[PDB]
Amino acid sequence: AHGPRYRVPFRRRREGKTNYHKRLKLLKSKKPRLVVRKTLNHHIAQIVVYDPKGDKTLVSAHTMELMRGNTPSAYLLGLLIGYKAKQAGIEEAILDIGLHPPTRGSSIFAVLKGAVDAGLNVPHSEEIYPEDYRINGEHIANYAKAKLPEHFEEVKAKIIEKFE
Amino acid sequence: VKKAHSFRRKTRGKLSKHPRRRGLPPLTRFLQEFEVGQKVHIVIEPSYHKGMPDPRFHGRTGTVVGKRGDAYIVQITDGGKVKTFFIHPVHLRPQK
Amino acid sequence: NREAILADWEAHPMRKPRIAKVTINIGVGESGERLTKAETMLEQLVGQKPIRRRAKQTNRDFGIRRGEPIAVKVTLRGEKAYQMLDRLLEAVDRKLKASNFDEHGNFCFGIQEHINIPGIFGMDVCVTLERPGFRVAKRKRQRRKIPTKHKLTKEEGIVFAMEELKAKV
Amino acid sequence: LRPAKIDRDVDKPAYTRREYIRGAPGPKITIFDMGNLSAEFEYEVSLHAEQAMQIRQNALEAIRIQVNRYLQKNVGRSNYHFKIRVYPFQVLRENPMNGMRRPFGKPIGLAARVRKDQKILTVWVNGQHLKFALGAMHRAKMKLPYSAYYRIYDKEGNDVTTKVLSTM
RNA sequence: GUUACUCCAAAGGGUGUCCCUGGCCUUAGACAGCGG
RNA sequence: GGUGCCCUAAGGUCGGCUCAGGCGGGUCUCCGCCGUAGAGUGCAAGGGCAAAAGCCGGCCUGACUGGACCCGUAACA
RNA sequence: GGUACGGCGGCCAUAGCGGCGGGGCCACACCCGGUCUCGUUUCGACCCCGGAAGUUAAGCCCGCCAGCGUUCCCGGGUGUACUGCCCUCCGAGAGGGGGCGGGAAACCGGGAACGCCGCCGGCCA
Numbered sequence A: 001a002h003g004p005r006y007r008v009p010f011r012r013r014r015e016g017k018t019n020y021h022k023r024l025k026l027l028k029s030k031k032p033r034l035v036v037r038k039t040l041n042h043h044i045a046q047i048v049v050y051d052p053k054g055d056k057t058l059v060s061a062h063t064m065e066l067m068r069g070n071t072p073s074a075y076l077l078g079l080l081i082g083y084k085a086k087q088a089g090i091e092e093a094i095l096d097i098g099l100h101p102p103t104r105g106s107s108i109f110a111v112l113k114g115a116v117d118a119g120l121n122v123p124h125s126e127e128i129y130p131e132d133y134r135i136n137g138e139h140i141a142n143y144a145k146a147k148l149p150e151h152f153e154e155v156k157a158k159i160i161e162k163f164e
Numbered sequence B: 001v002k003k004a005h006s007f008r009r010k011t012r013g014k015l016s017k018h019p020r021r022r023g024l025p026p027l028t029r030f031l032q033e034f035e036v037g038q039k040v041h042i043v044i045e046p047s048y049h050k051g052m053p054d055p056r057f058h059g060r061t062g063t064v065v066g067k068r069g070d071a072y073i074v075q076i077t078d079g080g081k082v083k084t085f086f087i088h089p090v091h092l093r094p095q096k
Numbered sequence C: 001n002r003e004a005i006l007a008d009w010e011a012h013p014m015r016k017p018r019i020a021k022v023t024i025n026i027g028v029g030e031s032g033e034r035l036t037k038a039e040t041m042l043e044q045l046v047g048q049k050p051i052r053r054r055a056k057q058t059n060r061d062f063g064i065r066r067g068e069p070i071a072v073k074v075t076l077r078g079e080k081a082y083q084m085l086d087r088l089l090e091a092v093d094r095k096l097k098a099s100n101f102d103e104h105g106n107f108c109f110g111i112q113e114h115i116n117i118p119g120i121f122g123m124d125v126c127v128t129l130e131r132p133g134f135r136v137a138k139r140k141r142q143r144r145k146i147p148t149k150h151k152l153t154k155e156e157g158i159v160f161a162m163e164e165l166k167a168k169v
Numbered sequence D: 001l002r003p004a005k006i007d008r009d010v011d012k013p014a015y016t017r018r019e020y021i022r023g024a025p026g027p028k029i030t031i032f033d034m035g036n037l038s039a040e041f042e043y044e045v046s047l048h049a050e051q052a053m054q055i056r057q058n059a060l061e062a063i064r065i066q067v068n069r070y071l072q073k074n075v076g077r078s079n080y081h082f083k084i085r086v087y088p089f090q091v092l093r094e095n096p097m098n099g100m101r102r103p104f105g106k107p108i109g110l111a112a113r114v115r116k117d118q119k120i121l122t123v124w125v126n127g128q129h130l131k132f133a134l135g136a137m138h139r140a141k142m143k144l145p146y147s148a149y150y151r152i153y154d155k156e157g158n159d160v161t162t163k164v165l166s167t168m
Numbered sequence E: 001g002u003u004a005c006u007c008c009a010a011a012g013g014g015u016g017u018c019c020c021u022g023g024c025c026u027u028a029g030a031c032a033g034c035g036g
Numbered sequence F: 001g002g003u004g005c006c007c008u009a010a011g012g013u014c015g016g017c018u019c020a021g022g023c024g025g026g027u028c029u030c031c032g033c034c035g036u037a038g039a040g041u042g043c044a045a046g047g048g049c050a051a052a053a054g055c056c057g058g059c060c061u062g063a064c065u066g067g068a069c070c071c072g073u074a075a076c077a
Numbered sequence G: 001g002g003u004a005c006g007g008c009g010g011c012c013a014u015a016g017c018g019g020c021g022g023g024g025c026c027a028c029a030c031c032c033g034g035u036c037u038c039g040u041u042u043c044g045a046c047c048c049c050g051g052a053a054g055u056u057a058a059g060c061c062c063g064c065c066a067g068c069g070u071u072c073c074c075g076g077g078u079g080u081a082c083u084g085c086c087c088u089c090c091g092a093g094a095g096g097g098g099g100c101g102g103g104a105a106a107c108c109g110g111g112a113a114c115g116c117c118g119c120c121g122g123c124c125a
Helices: A011-015 A020-027 A063-067 A071-088 A107-117 A149-162 C003-011 C038-045 C080-091 C132-137 C154-161 D057-074 D130-141 D161-165
Strands: A033-038 A043-049 A094-096 B039-042 B061-068 B071-078 B081-087 B092-094 C019-025 C051-053 C071-076 C107-109 C124-129 D033-035 D043-049 D053-056 D080-084 D090-094 D106-114 D119-125 D148-154
Touching (some): A033 A107, A043 A071, A043 A107, A063 A071, A071 A107, A071 A149, B039 B071, C003 C154, C038 C071, C071 C080, D053 D057, D057 D106, D057 D119, D119 D130, D130 D148
Parallel strands (some): A033 A094
Antiparallel strands (some): A033 A043, B061 B071, B071 B081, C019 C071, C019 C124, C051 C071, C107 C124, D043 D119, D053 D106, D080 D119, D090 D106
């Protein structure tokens, strides 16, 4: 810094991780939040609620425990969290995506699709959702000519038949 | 030359903000909770222009008696008259 | 002093420079109130549109009114820039003067209206270099500044330009 | 011009803001330093006020001229350093008559405000011109609206007025 | 001077007198007178 | 010291981006950098404001209807 | 139980600027390319999409440093400046004084200080 009258921003802003205006608009809703985060090779999905000493995380999910970074895996992650959280007993939520911008055709909204299909109530619109020929994988099974829906489908069956 | 009272009259220090706050307050204030009979302080945040009462009553202490909307109803004593305000909880602060 | 980029390659290319991009402009400005046809020229030259650049505060000589396009600029990267440079360096006289370089590893040709590699242009040509991992001072997420142990100077840039085509003064 | 008892006293707010005072006058005294400015003299000789005063620039310029002439003819320039420490910021007011209808003074002059035991002037001098320094101080003291007293400071800023007076 | 306040003079000065302080002198000091 | 107005945007929201000034290059609008805001805000002063309340755009007309309660002008009264 | 890993946060400079030494299975990054989801008043440079050939140089992580800025303590400055109540105290007056109670700011010297606290994981066994 360079003396008094210099204003040293909040830490999580300084780092570049959190928007406090959006955070406020979301907290004003007293419903639970569904945090969806994306990286180069993985996809994270948590359920959070507010406490004054620090947001408490109820349920979580990770693509690693899944396998035991694309739209198919995003959908399956959504499925996983939707079956976990409705078991926990919280049949309502709202979406938080953070500093990712909203674009129709993104694995974040595929996570939304999965969490809905798994049966969890989350307000949305049926137009940002990617198309199922990107969901299943036909995009990569088409790039193949210049991962298989076999595996996608029997994995979907695994998840559902285990979280029935 | 006389001059009526108005909202922002002689508010150059009372509604000035320290040069090191300068922005949004922490979010542990917009979401404050209060009960009935709870005593509260009236302390104004100059950045939020919604639900802000007359600065005449900056620094006074009242009691909560209800809720309307996201606002709280507050009673203060002004001489021997009772006065009722509708205030947003970022402008308030609990005793002790 | 070639030991500098010697060390560049030594450590490994993570610390190696390269060309971030190139740009070309009408510098002294010749449209005034018009939208000239060097517009069409530059497109014939390269093969992608030129970018108008409107006026500013009412001036005295160059753009004496606001809002009126006066100039043109364009941007090249990838291989177009490498290629377009390979003619241009040969076109200018050899042993380039570091006295037009930038104190941080950049430069911008003064020279005006010379035609090479196959009538009026007045022109200014600027280059921008950077090591690879500069992404982070641009990207939203976790943006921050760049230290000095990863930035550039005059010398490394000079030796990198000397690497192909022209030698220096 | 009008007597100085009207402007001696300090019982009145400060009036120093020219970006609000319309018609504020301009200074007469424009020289505050004299002699050898780059210098390493031995003895320092300063007037202190005995009580709060309000000194006009007329008086300051009178003091300047008198003292500087005296020391130029009795000491020489390379051997003394003379400084005035205080600038006139206080604007003085006079009522233009109508009588006492709309009374609020229009500006006439300037003054320097000085508090108790404050320095006003200073003559830096060697040890073989102290007589002249003190004569200068007498001449200056004679031209002020209230009283004053002098000391003699050493480098290291210490009072030696007694040890020096007793021996000269 | 013999005035709590109501109703009462200064800057500048004083071998007038009573006191504090610090240097230099002193068994020949500081004035006088006798001469160099 | 100012007001007796102006604005279909200078009004609502959504998204993206950052200012004045200077240094270093090129000639008489182009690249890079430092920059807590030293700019701007429809109009005075004060206050507020930086992933913005500023600039760039896209879609709209909450500048609506029917009604309650409370603060000020006008402290206490 | 272990980690020279991570996401969401609270207090919002005792956390900031600057400087240095070290580290990289799992993870975050920088990277190659982009037809399509998306678009750049012109460029997969920015943003979005699929992978990893390469490395730790940068960001991230561990450790330290008192050059600048901030905050707290110990002595001085100093019971100084200013001040509430009372006074048949001083003073020609301006303004000062006594008693009973409160009480700084600058500056000097010396210390500490280069962030603390929550919830949930992931992987090694």
